[PDB]
Design a protein around this ligand. Structure first.
Ligand SMILES: [Co+2]
Lengths: 9, 273, 100
């Protein structure tokens, strides 16, 4: 299962 | 020993609409989910039988979270153009990976998260799961942003929890496919090459998983130098192939032995032409 | 930016024997960026109905893909893989060497 959050560079 | 990895790539295409986004997951060398923004109706789709038992709520969430990811990474491509002083003229690629390794057994052995820009390491979560490594002063900005937002603590929670939990599940669900060991079928070929020499090529075919060690020895001594070793390659049926070759004096072929180590073998093989 | 040219292997799934159906593979790996064109050739002409695996990438961020087609090898027929990539000034042709 993928993580639920993805972040900004 | 087993691993789960997710990967993604965002690829810009100047003047031809928004960047293309792909995302995929693997357990070991086996792909099990894939998303492609170029699909008629983009969604996360299955790529291994063992994930098809998951219900609609799974596929809908994976799809939802991957679209979010896609949108975030399209913004990230714009930011990185700014960091690197790049124009809108050229295409750029932003790649990501996250994952967890198990050894033996049950809990996280190592977690990873890493980004690359235009084919080079950019930002990575350290093995401590607490700090970050930036490749340059642009990635140092992104690091400071990850620090302020407490990203490592979040990512650590996923890696130590969710990632390991679901890897365990997939390994069980896919146990017949994923926990198997198919030993290589092996042989050696010989061909003259000019100047009174011959190529001895040691083949390994039809094996799984991809990890294998092929070694040539002369007089029982490992030959480091002078061995050509091909990249392990897919057969196309879920198994792998590899070979290793050495060029030897004609008349001396018998002094060379190939040694093959693989999890599916009861014991290492030795082969001599 | 880093660009990397494709490594290319041309090979059959199973040991080749004349008159028996098989699959012809071209594995293209180690390349960056991701745009690539690959054709499989029989006696110099493009083969119909070539399929490929899903694009992916390695630990070192380089991309890879397998192109393949079903085929029945014969004594006289020659096969090859033709690859173009931004790192190449013209297409690269790699012949299938069947008794390596
Ligand atoms: Co295609």
């Amino acid at each position: 299962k993928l993580p639920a959050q993805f972040y900004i560079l | 020993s087993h691993s789960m990895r997710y990967f993604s790539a965002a690829v810009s295409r100047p003047g031809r609409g928004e960047p293309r986004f792909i995302a995929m997951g693997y357990v070991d060398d086996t792909q099990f989910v894939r998303f492609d923004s170029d699909s008629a109706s983009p969604r996360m789709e299955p790529r291994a039988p063992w994930v098809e038992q998951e219900g609609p709520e799974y596929w809908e969430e994976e799809t939802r979270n991957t679209k979010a990811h896609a949108q975030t990474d399209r913004m990230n491509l714009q930011t990185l153009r700014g960091y690197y002083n790049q124009s809108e003229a050229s295409s750029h690629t932003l790649q990501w990976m996250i994952g967890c390794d198990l050894g033996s057994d049950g809990r996280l052995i190592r977690g990873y998260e890493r980004y690359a820009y235009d084919g080079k390491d950019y930002l990575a979560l350290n093995e401590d799961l607490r700090s970050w490594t930036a490749a340059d002063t642009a990635a140092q900005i992104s690091k400071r942003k990850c620090e302020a937002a407490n990203v490592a603590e979040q990512r650590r929670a996923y890696l130590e929890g969710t990632c390991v939990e679901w890897l365990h599940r997939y390994l069980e669900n896919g146990k017949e496919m994923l926990q198997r060991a198919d030993p290589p079928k092996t042989h050696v070929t010989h061909h003259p090459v000019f100047d009174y020499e011959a190529t001895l090529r040691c083949w390994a075919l039809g094996f799984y998983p991809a990890e294998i060690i092929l070694t040539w020895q002369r007089d029982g001594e490992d030959q480091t130098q002078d061995v050509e070793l091909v990249e392990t390659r897919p057969a196309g049926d879920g198994t792998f192939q590899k070979w290793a070759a050495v060029v030897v004096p004609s008349g001396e072929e018998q002094r060379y032995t190939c040694h093959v180590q693989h999890e599916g073998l009861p014991e290492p093989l030795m082969l001599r032409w | 930016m880093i660009q990397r040219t494709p490594k290319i292997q041309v090979y059959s799934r199973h040991p080749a024997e004349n008159g028996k159906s098989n699959f012809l593979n071209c594995y293209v790996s180690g390349f960056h960026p991701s745009d690539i064109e690959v054709d499989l050739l029989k006696n110099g002409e493009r083969i119909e109905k070539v399929e490929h695996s899903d694009l992916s990438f390695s630990k070192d961020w380089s991309f890879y893909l397998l192109y393949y087609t079903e085929f029945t090898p014969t004594e006289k027929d020659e096969y090859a893989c033709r690859v173009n990539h931004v790192t190449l000034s013209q297409p690269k042709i790699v012949k299938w060497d069947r008794d390596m």
